[PDB]
Design a binder for this molecule. Structure first.
Ligand code: SF4
Ligand code: SF4
Ligand code: FES
Ligand code: ZN
Lengths: 687, 73, 112, 93, 181, 105
């Protein structure tokens, strides 16, 4: 029998396996599995409300009761460990009657507001009432009622629907790492709340909407807007950061209605950040929809594609080749970056790079800008040393993995960098490179803790990559790693945390800034979605072309605007921090006269007189095969082939400037988020 | 007058339902709980809704917009 | 008259192809009259279109596929002749009477 | 002295190889044996080592105007991978 | 003549190679047969003294895209002599012609035309096999699962040509698929 | 002809995150990536001109990867397969809620 949901079962050793019977059937499960898990392996779906596979067992809803032979009482399958020879029955009259009684108790005080409850149509309570207890209600007394609580602009609250499953409280304590929700009172009058007035400030707060089985906690911005049966589901990935969280995009017509997490055990474990979940509002706001050239009065005027491309092509031939600069945005896909690099190199320029701190790093070896441990591999670490990175605001899901590892395996965390608020206990070791020198020289309790660690993990933030003393910092970090045997054939504990979705693919493709001051001497600047570059460094007489879907400052400076597709409207290749390559899936049509980025670059190259040897995205990917073949081998995990030993020795001195903060505002990180009501309100109240 | 009502109502001669329901004074109740059916005949109203009156602010029936307050405290 | 059994091999299927092609060509004057094409297109262009349709499927090796294609061609010919739907430059499914394609498609739309 | 003049001749050098395949073993040995000296002698030359699970051992050089040349490294010994590099540096550059 | 007698007697009397599957159920007695034996089986059932299946009630196709032979052709038959009903089924694909039963049941003529129109299954020895329900010159077979509900073309009056004409479809409001599963 | 050359995706839709039940998995679909829709300028209704607007999610279905791949290759479409993500069952114990913190450090 196939396991429920195709769940995979891993056996450490076949000797450590026991035999249990689920409705006569023989199934084999690892030692330590619960009765419910054995039922799932058998393919039998046990109803449940309070149990969640990613949260500690509670056993309070009593909906998972089954009959076990020689047991006097019905058994809570979610909590009872499986034993050899156990005979589990799930469809006996005892189990059915227990389920009917529990369902009757659940619906006793439940409000009659399905037509106004957003959970309607995707409600576990409705389905289990239809299936297990198809008992005619007989409760005729007065129902209890509960007042609503204010939890912020993201989570809408209707507490009459709450069934006291305590999933939200356990999520807050165990996953979010922010203990704000509790269960107050006693008996039937117990109420989930914060007691004092306070809003849920965790960056993972939005997941309580997913985990709540009833409509007690719902998305406030999504409130009442649609029913689940009229939504089209598209399976794609997020581009808010360099994590590549798997998401499902729900749309109705040419509009994205909501974004909910998608299961991926290796990346985000059915969780997403609040930025990922609530940034969809900006997709329909301040969209660049038509090509524009600034008119005589210095005002933008809408034109056709041919006219704008002719203008850009004509003016790009009037500058020196070293005076052409192309910058790729943080949301750029690999195909457009490759086409941009080819176009700029074929005009005789080498000034192509991706916006962000890691613009001019050494990209020779792939280990030097990727999380070599892998996100799932972090759970095996016994010590964490974070150098110049705030994972909570830089990579929310990576920080969630670190917090989960700390909670479960009692791993230690040492932090070097500016003061920051962590959701887990961690020693502040210092603020800058002097701490790195101290760590290298030893004589510290954390130094011997690092030496006494079996699987230590160093995580270096990409924000340190733009410092003047970058080589010295990297050399010191690698010396620390070598002295403590951090990199071994059985353990790669050296990691570099990127911040932008496009950064990994850009580094793989070789989009590296050679001249450190090429922007200050440029006369033709192509900003392909690079809204985060500082545009006052551009000379006032330079011809600036902006291509993208949003924009605030670069749009003001741009002489020509070329509307581009958004990540929800195209199929593009993105690589995350750990070197995992994924592809987006189109969910909605583009707006106005927008085009895909690589299409725009290829069209301009043809207009400019350069003939690129590809006319489709397949040709672009075949070209990419000659540069970074790992970018076209999508959804594959591959270990590092080369390590620190090949790096040339560096003797640069160590500067005294402390580490700076990369993400000043978690909600304001990209042009999509900066065009959203909800993100602005979160910045206003949740920060 | 708000953005919600302006999406469908293109006549300003009459008050919108939002203003009309807001003009109905809160119903005073002896007790901390009240059940609203939206009609004197329950079969002609909306599904019964039990509303808690523990807060000082008037409590709103989520089906018909009627508002209730505790009479004494 | 009745639907024949499937061709046993490629030889008899080819014979059925030749019969269908002859029947299609012999009906060209009727089609020219029905659609008033005297001043629009030559009869040989119709013959050439039919033969080109036959040639574009010259790689087929399964006799059953050939038999089905012949049956569909006969039905389409019958509807063209017996139940003509006059348009102008179009009979049934055939149109009667310095930049690469990528740039034209890009100027057209974002869906190629 | 050609090894110290690679930057003057090409803008970018790429070496594609398989991590585990025997066909890529000479290329992996060449990288492990020569990258240190090549990068020390050419500190400003991007030498992109890109490994992929199923690619044939290849080596690419990118010159001016985006012109590129490629050499197939299959069936080659570590010193002949060095000759090919010298040829790429000295001719067409 | 009850469904127990029909099942047992047909097992005892029919040539074995004609029937691959026999179902006895309150939903109906069902015989499955290869396409090459369908005609002979139906002739036997019609002529044999103990069956006298004289009325062909209908023929219909069912599309199963997950199957190598995606089409299933169902023959619903009736014996007024014995007040009993029988269902006989065979499978088919997009290019394999099956035997017509018009010479056995004249009523089959139009039902076969319908199967060909709706699904694309062809019938050997059918005297006049052309589409019967769709518009003249229709392309495709609408009851196939992959055929879109609104089709591919629509018609409108064209004043410059002074006639009704066909163009590719354009939907003011697309059909909304509500997935309640 | 014109619609037989389009590119499609063969995939198995994953389980929704709003429900704990798993009864809609194991099905295989052919995504036609129909993303050309607009608003009718009379009533604001969502209009389309793509015949495969909803057939991939309403009618066409396949019980296995192989069946969908065979159908796509018989119809001549260019298809890419996306393997579905599946959960990893891990040893969980209710006793873990009361783990000893050890002697004070
Ligand atoms: S949670 Fe909402 S949809 Fe579910 S039973 Fe309660 S009111 Fe109905
Ligand atoms: S609010 Fe939802 S998740 Fe929290 S205890 Fe109530 S029903 Fe459970
Ligand atoms: S799921 Fe086991 S008691 Fe709730
Ligand atoms: Zn009411």
């Amino acid at each position: 029998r196939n396991p429920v949901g195709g769940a995979r079962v891993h056996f450490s050793n076949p000797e450590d396996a026991i035999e249990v019977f689920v409705d006569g059937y023989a199934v084999k499960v690892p030692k330590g599995f619960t009765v419910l898990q054995a039922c799932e392996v058998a393919g039998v779906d046990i109803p449940r409300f309070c149990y969640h596979s990613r949260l500690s067992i509670a056993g309070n809803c009593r909906m998972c009761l089954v009959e076990v032979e020689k047991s006097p009482k019905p058994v809570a399958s979610c909590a009872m460990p499986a034993l050899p020879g156990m005979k589990i029955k799930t469809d006996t009259p005892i189990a059915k009657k227990a389920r009917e009684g529990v369902m009757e108790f659940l619906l006793m005080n439940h409000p009659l507001d399905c037509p106004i409850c957003d959970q309607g149509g995707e409600c576990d309570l409705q389905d289990q009432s239809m299936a297990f207890g198809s008992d005619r209600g007989r409760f005729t007394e007065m129902k209890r009622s509960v007042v609503d609580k204010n939890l912020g602009p993201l989570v809408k609250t209707v507490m009459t629907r709450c069934i006291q499953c305590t999933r939200c409280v356990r999520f807050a304590s165990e996953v979010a790492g922010v203990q704000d929700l509790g269960i107050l009172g006693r008996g039937s009058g117990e109420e989930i709340g914060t007691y004092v007035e306070k809003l849920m400030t965790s960056e993972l707060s939005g997941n309580v909407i997913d985990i709540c089985p009833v409509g007690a906690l719902t998305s406030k911005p999504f409130a009442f807007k649609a029913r689940n049966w009229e939504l089209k589901a598209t399976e794609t990935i997020d581009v808010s950061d360099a994590v590549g969280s798997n998401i499902r995009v729900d749309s109705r017509g040419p509009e994205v209605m909501r974004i909910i997490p998608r299961l991926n055990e290796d990346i985000n474990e059915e969780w997403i950040s609040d930025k990922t979940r609530f940034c969809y509002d900006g997709l329909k706001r301040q969209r660049l929809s038509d090509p524009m050239i600034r008119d005589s009065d210095g005002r933008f005027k809408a034109v056709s594609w041919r006219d704008a491309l002719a203008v850009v092509g004509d003016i790009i031939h009037q500058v020196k080749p070293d005076e052409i600069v192309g910058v790729a945005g943080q949301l750029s896909d690999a195909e457009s970056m490759m086409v941009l690099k080819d176009f700029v190199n074929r005009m005789g320029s080498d000034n192509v790079w991706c916006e962000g701190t890691a613009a001019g790093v050494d990209a020779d070896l792939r280990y030097s800008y990727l999380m070599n441990t892998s996100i799932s591999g972090l759970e095996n670490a016994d010590l964490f040393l974070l150098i110049g990175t705030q994972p909570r605001v830089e990579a929310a899901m990576v920080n969630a993995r670190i917090c989960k590892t700390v909670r479960a395996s009692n791993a230690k965390v040492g932090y070097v960098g500016p003061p920051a608020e962590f959701n887990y206990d961690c020693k502040h070791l210092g603020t800058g490179p002097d701490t790195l020198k101290e760590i290298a020289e030893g004589r510290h309790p954390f130094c011997t803790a690092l030496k006494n660690a079996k699987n230590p993990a160093i995580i270096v933030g990409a924000g340190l990559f733009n410092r003047t003393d970058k080589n010295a910092i990297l050399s010191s970090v690698e010396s620390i790693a070598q002295a403590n045997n951090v990199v071994r054939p059985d353990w790669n504990g050296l990691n570099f945390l990127l911040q932008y979705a496009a950064q990994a693919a850009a580094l793989d493709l070789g989009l590296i800034q050679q001249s450190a001051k090429a922007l200050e001497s440029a006369k033709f600047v192509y900003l392909m979605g690079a809204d985060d570059v500082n545009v006052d460094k551009i000379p006032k007489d330079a011809f600036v072309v902006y291509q993208g879907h949003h924009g605030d400052k670069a749009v003001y400076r741009a002489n020509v605007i070329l509307p581009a597709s958004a990540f929800t409207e195209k199929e593009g290749t993105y690589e995350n921090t750990e070197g995992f390559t994924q592809q987006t899936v189109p969910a909605v049509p583009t707006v106005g006269d927008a085009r895909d980025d690589w299409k725009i670059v290829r069209a301009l190259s043809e207009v400019s007189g350069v003939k690129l040897p590809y006319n489709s995205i397949e040709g672009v990917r075949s070209r990419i095969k000659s540069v970074a073949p790992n970018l076209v081998h999508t959804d594959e995990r591959e270990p590092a082939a080369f390590g620190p030993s090949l790096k040339p020795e560096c003797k640069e001195a160590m500067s005294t400037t402390p580490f700076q903060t990369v993400v000043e505002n978690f909600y304001m990180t990209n042009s999509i988020t900066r065009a959203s009501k909800i993100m602005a309100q979160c910045s206003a109240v949740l920060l | 007058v708000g953005n919600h009502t302006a999406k469908w109502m293109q006549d300003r001669s009459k008050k919108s339902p939002m203003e009309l329901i807001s003009e109905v004074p809160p119903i005073k109740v002896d007790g901390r709980i009240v059940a609203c059916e939206g009609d004197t005949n329950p079969a002609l109203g909306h599904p019964i809704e039990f509303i808690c009156l523990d807060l000082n602010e008037p409590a709103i029936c989520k089906y018909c917009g009627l508002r209730y307050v505790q009479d004494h405290h | 008259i009745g639907v024949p059994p499937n061709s046993a091999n490629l030889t008899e299927a080819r014979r059925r192809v030749f019969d269908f092609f002859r029947a299609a060509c012999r009906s060209i004057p009727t089609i020219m009259d029905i659609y008033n094409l005297q001043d629009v297109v030559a009869p040989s262009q119709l013959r050439y279109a039919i033969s080109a349709q036959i040639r574009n499927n010259a790689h087929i090796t399964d006799p059953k596929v050939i038999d089905l294609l012949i049956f569909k061609g006969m039905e389409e010919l019958t509807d063209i002749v017996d139940h003509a739907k006059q348009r102008h430059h179009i009979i049934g499914q055939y149109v009667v009477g310095g930049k690469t394609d990528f740039l034209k498609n890009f100027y057209t739309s974002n869906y190629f | 002295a050609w090894r110290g003049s690679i930057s003057k001749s090409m803008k970018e050098l790429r070496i594609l190889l398989c991590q585990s395949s025997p066909a890529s073993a000479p290329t992996r040995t060449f990288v492990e044996k020569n990258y240190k000296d090549l990068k020390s002698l050419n500190p400003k030359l991007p030498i992109l080592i890109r490994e992929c699970s199923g690619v044939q051992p290849q080596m690419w050089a990118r010159y001016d105007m985006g012109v590129e040349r490629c050499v197939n490294l299959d069936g080659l010994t570590e010193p002949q991978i060095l000759k090919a590099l010298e040829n790429l540096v000295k001719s067409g550059a | 003549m009850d469904n127990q007698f029909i099942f047992k007697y047909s097992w005892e009397t029919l040539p074995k190679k004609w029937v691959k599957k026999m179902e006895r159920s309150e939903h109906g007695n069902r015989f499955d047969t290869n396409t090459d034996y369908l005609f002979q089986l139906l002739c036997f059932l019609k002529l044999h003294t103990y069956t006298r299946v004289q009325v062909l009630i209908d023929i219909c196709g069912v599309d199963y895209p997950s199957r190598k032979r995606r089409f299933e052709v169902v023959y619903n038959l009736l014996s007024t002599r014995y007040n009993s009903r029988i269902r006989v089924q065979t499978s088919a694909d997009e290019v394999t012609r099956i035997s017509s039963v018009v010479s056995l049941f004249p009523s089959a003529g139009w039902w076969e035309r319908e199967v060909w129109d709706m699904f694309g299954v062809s019938f050997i020895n059918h005297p006049d096999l052309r589409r019967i329900l769709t518009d003249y010159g229709f392309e495709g077979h609408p009851l196939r699962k992959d055929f879109p509900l609104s089709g591919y073309v629509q018609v409108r009056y064209d004043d410059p040509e002074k006639r009704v004409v066909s163009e590719p479809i354009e939907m003011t409001q697309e059909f909304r698929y509500f997935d309640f599963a | 002809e014109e619609h037989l050359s389009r590119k499609v995706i063969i995939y198995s839709p994953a389980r929704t995150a709003t429900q704990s039940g798993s009864g809609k998995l194991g099905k295989w679909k052919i995504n036609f990536v129909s993303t050309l829709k607009w608003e009718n300028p009379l009533m604001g209704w969502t209009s389309t001109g793509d015949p495969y607007a909803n057939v991939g999610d309403s009618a066409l279905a396949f019980d296995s990867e192989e069946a969908a791949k065979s159908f796509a290759e018989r119809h001549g479409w260019d298809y890419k397969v996306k393997k579905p993500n599946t959960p990893l069952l891990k040893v969980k114990s209710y006793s873990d809620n009361f783990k000893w913190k050890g002697n004070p450090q």
